[PDB]
Design an enzyme around this catalytic site. Structure first.
Site, short mmCIF file in Angstrom:
data_model
loop_
_atom_site.label_atom_id
_atom_site.label_comp_id
_atom_site.label_asym_id
_atom_site.label_seq_id
_atom_site.Cartn_x
_atom_site.Cartn_y
_atom_site.Cartn_z
N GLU A 153 -12.62 23.94 -15.36
CA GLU A 153 -12.29 23.87 -16.77
C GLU A 153 -12.12 22.42 -17.20
O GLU A 153 -12.52 22.04 -18.30
CB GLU A 153 -11.02 24.67 -17.05
CG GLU A 153 -10.68 24.89 -18.51
CD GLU A 153 -9.46 25.75 -18.69
OE1 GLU A 153 -9.12 26.46 -17.77
OE2 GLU A 153 -8.84 25.67 -19.73
N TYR B 108 0.81 -1.20 0.00
CA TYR B 108 0.00 0.00 0.00
C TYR B 108 0.85 1.25 0.00
O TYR B 108 0.46 2.26 -0.59
CB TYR B 108 -0.95 0.01 1.19
CG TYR B 108 -2.15 -0.88 1.00
CD1 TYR B 108 -2.65 -1.10 -0.27
CD2 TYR B 108 -2.77 -1.46 2.09
CE1 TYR B 108 -3.75 -1.91 -0.45
CE2 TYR B 108 -3.87 -2.26 1.92
CZ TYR B 108 -4.36 -2.49 0.65
OH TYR B 108 -5.46 -3.30 0.47
#
Ligand SMILES: CC(=O)O[C@H]1C(=O)[C@@]2(C)[C@H]([C@H](OC(=O)c3ccccc3)[C@]3(O)C[C@H](OC(=O)[C@H](O)[C@@H](NC(=O)c4ccccc4)c4ccccc4)C(C)=C1C3(C)C)[C@]1(OC(C)=O)CO[C@@H]1C[C@@H]2O
Ligand SMILES: CC(=O)O[C@H]1C(=O)[C@@]2(C)[C@H]([C@H](OC(=O)c3ccccc3)[C@]3(O)C[C@H](OC(=O)[C@H](O)[C@@H](NC(=O)c4ccccc4)c4ccccc4)C(C)=C1C3(C)C)[C@]1(OC(C)=O)CO[C@@H]1C[C@@H]2O
Ligand SMILES: Nc1nc2c(ncn2[C@@H]2O[C@H](COP(=O)(O)OP(=O)(O)OP(=O)(O)O)[C@@H](O)[C@H]2O)c(=O)[nH]1
Ligand SMILES: Nc1nc2c(ncn2[C@@H]2O[C@H](COP(=O)(O)OP(=O)(O)OP(=O)(O)O)[C@@H](O)[C@H]2O)c(=O)[nH]1
Ligand SMILES: Nc1nc2c(ncn2[C@@H]2O[C@H](COP(=O)(O)OP(=O)(O)O)[C@@H](O)[C@H]2O)c(=O)[nH]1
Ligand SMILES: Nc1nc2c(ncn2[C@@H]2O[C@H](COP(=O)(O)OP(=O)(O)O)[C@@H](O)[C@H]2O)c(=O)[nH]1
Ligand SMILES: [Mg+2]
Ligand SMILES: [Mg+2]
Lengths: 426, 427, 426, 427
Positions: free
Chosen positions: B242, B212
């Site tokens: 945007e 992990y």
């Protein structure tokens, strides 16, 4: 007289920044605003673009409009942060994000007055206002939104003055947004109705020119804007010093628009050559016209030779024979009589100024009113249509209060523009 | 231009650790907050700038790791919200009985941050679908947050219940229940498969034993390129809204895949010569997808390419032209184009003690596609199967979760699948 | 001639302290009271504001009135503790505590004679007393209480002299008391009847100006008072040296009050610009008038453009063309003919003094008699009403012997004032 | 500009200890009175300035702690008034049999102080409602003091019988009997809940084990900001009667809540970045109320905000505008505004050996509201219940306290409650 220069959006601001570099250099102005030029003619019409502040500090008659703080910051942090006046820096809430409605209809609309107040302040510092120049993109959102927004507002104030704009046109193969047709279509819809002259520049075309002729390994935006700025200067350079034949924005319009609505122009610039090839240049009027009437040197993507020339302006720079120029103009129209529109007797309007661009022995700039430009409008319209048929991205404008009717009306009106150019082409 | 980050359960927190490590590395910020950026760190007069983040875990464990480990001095103690009893892989408990006991505090802490924040752009939520403290609690929080800030952008970076392998057996349930909240309230969601990453670690980073730690670092690196990148001032500063403008064509379809194409080992960093086209090409290869999905069996709706470090627009455009020339990958027929470009000037971020070798440039891709929709079908089968037997249903009923809610959750997921089908087919 | 300057209350005292800083600097006076100026004209009318004590020690013709010892102490501990005369420091029992009745009716009334004795002493040191200037707040309690109290008393002594006051008006969004309407209403009730001219200044308006134009990060009271002091000087600066067109408090009143009662004025000041923007200034008469007739530069909160101009005074400072000024005045009235009251032929009274403020090349100050000011009175009246309808806080004045009748009478009379301004607006 | 402080029972004295410690810290005054302010300390030619205070306890115990502990040299021996037999939680005994035996001395000591004092502004009484030596004696004293000084301001800082928990079982009685005296004779009263403070210590100061020492220090710190603050000469020196001018709209309603919004731990002092708006906002959050009351269920009648240290008026005004913009909290409809501001130049006071970490600025809020009235209803129920059974009544009857007095006391309290109801409703 005096001319107001308004910049709108990052694109327009970057181009304008380069523009003001160029003409400040042209007129002997350093990065403090002080004059240290060698000629007297540099001060003969310095008032056109500069206020003369106490201490002889020359201040750009320009308004800097943006909705994205940060770009405006880069301007202040650049070499001309000591040049531009602080109260001409107009910005607030964050930018449209390629949303024309935000730029024109809503968020940008809220800040219109903060611009117009500056416009008035500039106007009242003038002895005779001739007109306005707007620098912006045609798809950016803010530049295209605030662009037509301010154009409408300004004309309402100054209906009898000249509305000029330099617009960066959506290029076939050079993008950065998928709503480029929406923004362009909504923009041009209002552009035509409220504009006296507009110039169409493609980044793609410049990308081609900056390599094909200038052989640049890494053409940057600063180089493309540089090409633009050269032509921007040429358009009004005749107003700023002596010449054999004077010219003007009005004079051009009078000789460049035959049909009210058809005021879209392709721009070009003479001596385009790489620094290793400059030594092979003849620097003659013949040579210049070979380049000026070369389709490959046009800063619009559309190749003129697919259409016809309604009218051409050829503005020359530096000492030269008037006969020599006239001869070349004749040779050109004789060479390609099929390209020029026969309805016009002399298809080419000329002008000659006594001062070449500093460092050049002789130059020129080209403004073409061709019918070929219709093809750029077609291409964009098709892209718009394809998306619009699925109401793609429409909710971004719906959420701003924009309906479908505007979009269909705009496209219908865009078709009229193309149709008119086709009407006047065989 | 500022934003707020949110971390839930254990996964959201562990991912957060990687993210805030990166941001510190980028801005030179020390473990006690000292700088020797304001969109991630609240300005402190002493120089000890503090992360704009909310940490939630109904069993303090992972937060205690933060409280006792490095960057305990970085984060503000008020931000480290913990419970007493965990949700324990139960969406319903995280949604209701347990989560609701701290949600008031959570919202209050958010409000404080939002009151401090001037130009708030939006939020960035890090969560999973497996645990209830991630899945259920997030569902609760997103609803509440949506009410308070209807005008602010809500990003969700989720760890997608992997199709091949997982760690809990009641994931399908928690996943399907989450879907109808995320699709409802989020503005843009990302789905990441741990197994796809582990595979990337094996193939590109040459790692036989991945965990992990490294996995999260890759995810965080992507987020940096999505967000922080913009805040360093590049050539093309594409706003977060945007992104949405160009990436999202509809009111729905808020599921972009986020890839990173400079994934490279230290050895390869010497032999490999990368550039704009090479890296750009790599991101369209069904290998670095960061999710169990093969783009070649769907269509591209939209694709934002984010560049960092030593790039130029000319090469980027050329690479894209080459891609459109390739024509192997299919695009939505009624989408003329789908390419958008963001460009930084600041180089890629390097993690001391990491693997991802230092490069002079980087590319992230945020892509919407119809191919990803197929992944939900796999989840549907897993859900349908366990649901048919009502396996483990009594853990949700014990909370009070209406059985019909599960059927409704499925229908909403199925609707989403249907929408993507229509996008690809219609023209 | 000579003018008496009386300060009342902390607000008025702080403003006055800044005022005396300004004009002492203007007239070359150091912190001992000694003259070390470079001009001769600084001593030409120094008698206006200073007694000439033995040793050429120039002593403020001013009376310092307060009911809160401590503020008076801060004055003595400040740079002008060596300037002001000790027997002009009048204070005793603790202050009103925003209780107008304490300031005017009771506690302050007990100490009136201790002021008036000083007034007489000042009067008899004069060669020709022209009038009085009072500086105070309009809501403070003591400044507003003692203010109108002393105004009444002084007019009884000098009914034929000019009563001028600079009053800080309760601002919509800038408070510090909940009985601001009670104190203001009770004050103005007596103010109008006994005052020849009064200036209305809003702290809110100054807060806006000091950022919008001066870009101050931390606008303090010392900066707001500074703005006020600049205009205070301008009002009487014409009396203290040579000029192309002289002016006077009487002259202004004659050209500024068309209707006896309507003698409330908005004040403004020319060149308002930040220290980083000063380099972009033109410093021309045009520029100055753009600022002077800018609503945003008015020190009253009410925006003039919601009303009309009954009459305007434009007092200019420094060398300039008389024609140039006249031209600009004409341009302004032509520009906004809808703003100016048509009943007046020339709406603008002008004056030009030969000496700009030390350090400025050219300045000016603006005094407007607009009808818009009625809106400030309305707002306050509404706040007053809302409270008064519940007899809120009334017991604070009841305990001083004030009845309800006064309050209803005052409001009725306040309505008349507004009504009159509305009568003379379209 | 001078004032006199009064301390009764044990609580008033212990609170006083904190107050006079603070004043010493502020003025640099030593434990023997030596300075190396005249409104708290009578000027001494030797430099040993002495507190303007009266200490009363009918069982010298707590006073003996003062007499034998630190600041025995600070206080004058004449001020340390003690009895022999305590009132023992009996208002009636404190009011009559026991208290009346020393009240003559007490008034005589006050007279001496008042004769020494030139510009006497008023008094500051520290008492409780629990004990009879606090409650009953204060009732006696306030009546007597009111007669002698009808023109002087009488402040009462009381420890409100907490609604959740208490220490005596006959508090309701002593509290309700006090009410009709305080409401009658006081000019401004404050009510403080120990339990609300303990809660504040837990949440803000992060204290799991809080006691009277720290609790009192917080209360004293508030009083410093109310009073002493003014005597340091700030930008806005709001008088004590000026407080009353703006805070009090009627002949009654003399019950402002006094909060302190810079409550902060030493750890938080490093991570937290406070400022004018942040702190100002905190004081309107139903958490630092210093009393078991939730403002959001009533209306604001008036609110004075007192600032210390590094503040500016611009930010203060802006914060207030934001509050009025927020509109979450309700204000009295017929009160156009309710905001008043006091501003110091002197920083906040720091207690060596305290917890409240050093800050660069501070805010106190003195607020009148209709929400607080609800607290008396809780007391009414407690009283009504015990009263109905006449529980413990024989301890007051044994004094001679008329049974009808209890019914009258209730009616006066009920009247007060009614008044606040009318304020909120009427418009
Ligand atoms: C030693 C020498 O003669 O150098 C030339 C040169 O080598 C050439 C290649 C110049 C050069 O221009 C470019 O390379 C170029 C770069 C980016 C975009 C566009 C062009 C030159 O840089 C540009 C420069 O132009 C000018 O000085 C003009 O006044 C021009 N100025 C600017 O564009 C400008 C540049 C930087 C800063 C401020 C202004 C101009 C043109 C029209 C209107 C106003 C001003 C010139 C003659 C040269 C150099 C310096 C190498 C050329 O361009 C121009 C605009 O003159 C390119 O082809 C021409 C032919 C020139 O001979
Ligand atoms: C290097 C230089 O030229 O500095 C200027 C300057 O920068 C500017 C910004 C000044 C400056 O004024 C302020 O910044 C200001 C601060 C608080 C409140 C109001 C104003 C200046 O401080 C103020 C000062 O004004 C004067 O000297 C006048 O005589 C003025 N004096 C005072 O207000 C005064 C200040 C301190 C102590 C004693 C007097 C005055 C105006 C009207 C009537 C009588 C006197 C000037 C020209 C300047 C500085 C010094 C930077 C400006 O103001 C004035 C009143 O002139 C602000 O906009 C103008 C434009 C000036 O150019
Ligand atoms: N990518 C990634 N996934 C993780 C990590 N840690 C846990 N996960 C995944 O997240 C799933 C559970 O998510 P969480 O909400 O964090 O579980 P939790 O924190 O214990 O919360 P509860 O299980 O409800 O108590 C696991 O099955 C893992 O697959 C991590 O560090 N990185
Ligand atoms: N805030 C605070 N409250 C206290 C303190 N000490 C006691 N109290 C409260 O005060 C109540 C009793 O008040 P006092 O009048 O001081 O009691 P006393 O001093 O013994 O007087 P008698 O009880 O009448 O003998 C207790 O129930 C406590 O709740 C203290 O130090 N701080
Ligand atoms: N000619 C030119 N065009 C640019 C430049 N930068 C961006 N553009 C174009 O302008 C568009 C974006 O416009 P922009 O100014 O960012 O509008 P905004 O995003 O709404 O502020 C892009 O699609 C580009 O094609 C530049 O430096 N030069
Ligand atoms: N312009 C200005 N106004 C002030 C200043 N200080 C206070 N005020 C205003 O004056 C009012 C208080 O008046 P004040 O002089 O204290 O009257 P007093 O309290 O009765 O003595 C406040 O409400 C403020 O709005 C200052 O320095 N400048
Ligand atoms: Mg868990
Ligand atoms: Mg006791």
């Amino acid at each position: 007289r005096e001319i107001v220069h308004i910049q709108a959006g990052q694109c327009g601001n970057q181009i304008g920044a380069k523009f003001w570099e160029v003409i400040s250099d042209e007129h002997g102005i350093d990065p403090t605003g002080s004059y240290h030029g060698d000629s007297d003619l540099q001060l003969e019409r310095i008032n056109v673009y500069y206020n003369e502040a106490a201490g002889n500090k020359y201040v750009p008659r320009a308004i800097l409009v943006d909705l994205e703080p940060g770009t405006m910051d880069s301007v202040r942090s650049g070499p001309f942060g000591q040049i531009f006046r602080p109260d001409n820096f107009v910005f607030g809430q964050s930018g449209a994000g390629n949303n024309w409605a935000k730029g024109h209809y809503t968020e940008g609309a809220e800040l219109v007055d903060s611009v117009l107040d500056v416009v008035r302040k500039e106007s009242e510092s003038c002895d005779c206002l001739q007109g306005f120049q707007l620098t912006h993109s045609l798809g950016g959102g803010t530049g295209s939104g605030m662009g037509t927004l301010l154009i409408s507002k300004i004309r309402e104030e100054y209906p009898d003055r000249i509305m000029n704009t330099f617009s960066v046109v959506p290029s076939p193969k050079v993008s950065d947004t998928v709503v480029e047709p929406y923004n362009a279509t909504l923009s041009v819809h209002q552009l035509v109705e409220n504009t006296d002259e507009t110039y169409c520049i493609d980044n793609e075309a410049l990308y081609d020119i900056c390599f094909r002729t200038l052989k640049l390994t890494t053409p940057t935006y600063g180089d493309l804007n540089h090409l633009v700025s050269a032509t921007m200067s040429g358009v009004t350079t005749c107003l700023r010093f002596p010449g054999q034949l004077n010219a003007d924005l009005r004079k051009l319009a009078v000789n460049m628009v035959p049909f009210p609505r058809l005021h879209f122009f392709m721009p070009g610039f003479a001596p385009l050559t790489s620094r290793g090839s400059q030594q092979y240049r003849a620097l003659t009027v013949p040579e210049l016209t070979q380049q000026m009437f070369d389709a490959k040197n046009m800063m619009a993507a559309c190749d003129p030779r697919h259409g016809r020339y309604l009218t051409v302006a050829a503005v020359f720079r530096g000492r030269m024979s008037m006969k020599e120029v006239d001869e070349q103009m004749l040779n050109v129209q004789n060479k390609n009589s099929s390209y020029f529109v026969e309805w016009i007797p002399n298809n080419v309007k000329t002008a000659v100024c006594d001062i070449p661009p500093r460092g050049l022995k002789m130059s020129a700039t080209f403004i073409g009113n061709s019918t070929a430009i219709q093809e750029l409008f077609k291409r964009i319209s098709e892209q718009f249509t394809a998306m619009f048929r699925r109401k793609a991205f429409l909710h971004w404008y719906t959420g701003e209060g924009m309906d479908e009717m505007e979009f269909t009306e705009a496209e219908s009106n865009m078709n009229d523009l193309v149709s008119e150019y086709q009407q006047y082409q065989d | 231009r500022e934003c707020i980050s949110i971390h839930v359960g254990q996964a959201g927190v562990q991912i957060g650790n990687a993210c805030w490590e990166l941001y510190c590395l980028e801005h030179g910020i020390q473990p006690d907050g000292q700088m020797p950026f304001n969109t991630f760190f609240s300005e402190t007069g002493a120089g000890k700038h503090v992360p704009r983040a909310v940490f939630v875990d109904l069993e303090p464990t992972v937060i205690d790791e933060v409280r006792t480990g490095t960057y305990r001095q970085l984060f503000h103690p008020e931000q480290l919200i913990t419970g007493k009893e965990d949700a324990a892989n139960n969406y319903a408990r995280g949604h209701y009985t347990i989560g609701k006991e701290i949600i008031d505090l959570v919202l209050d802490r958010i409000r404080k941050l939002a009151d401090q924040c001037t130009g708030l752009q939006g939020f960035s939520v890090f969560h999973s679908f497996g645990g209830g403290t991630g899945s259920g609690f997030t569902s609760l929080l997103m609803e509440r947050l949506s009410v308070d800030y209807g005008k602010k952008s809500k990003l969700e970076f989720s760890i997608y219940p992997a199709p091949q392998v997982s760690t809990a057996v009641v994931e399908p349930y928690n996943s399907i229940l989450t879907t109808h909240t995320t699709l409802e309230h989020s503005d843009c969601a990302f789905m990441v498969d741990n197994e796809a990453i582990y595979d990337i670690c094996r193939r590109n980073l040459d790692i036989e034993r991945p965990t992990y730690t490294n996995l999260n670092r890759l995810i965080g690196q992507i987020v940096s390129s999505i967000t922080a990148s913009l805040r360093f001032d590049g050539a093309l500063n594409v706003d977060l809204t945007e992104f949405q403008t160009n990436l999202v064509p509809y009111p729905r379809g808020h599921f972009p895949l986020a890839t990173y194409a400079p994934v490279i080992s230290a050895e390869k960093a010497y032999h490999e010569q990368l550039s704009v086209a090479e890296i750009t090409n790599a991101c369209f290869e069904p290998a670095n997808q960061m999710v169990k999905c093969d783009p070649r069996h769907g269509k591209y709706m939209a694709c934002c390419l984010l560049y960092r470090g030593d790039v130029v627009p000319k090469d980027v455009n050329a690479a894209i032209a080459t891609i459109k020339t390739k024509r192997t990958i299919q695009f939505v027929d009624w989408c003329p184009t789908g390419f958008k470009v963001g460009i930084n000037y600041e180089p890629p971020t390097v993690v001391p003690g990491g693997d991802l070798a230092k490069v002079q440039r980087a590319v992230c891709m945020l892509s919407n596609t119809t191919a990803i929709a197929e992944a939900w079908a796999r989840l549907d089968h897993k859900f349908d199967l366990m649901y048919a037997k009502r396996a483990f249903v009594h853990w949700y009923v014990g909370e009070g979760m209406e059985e019909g809610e599960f059927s409704e959750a499925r229908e909403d997921m199925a609707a989403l699948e249907k929408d993507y089908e229509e996008v690809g087919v219609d023209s």
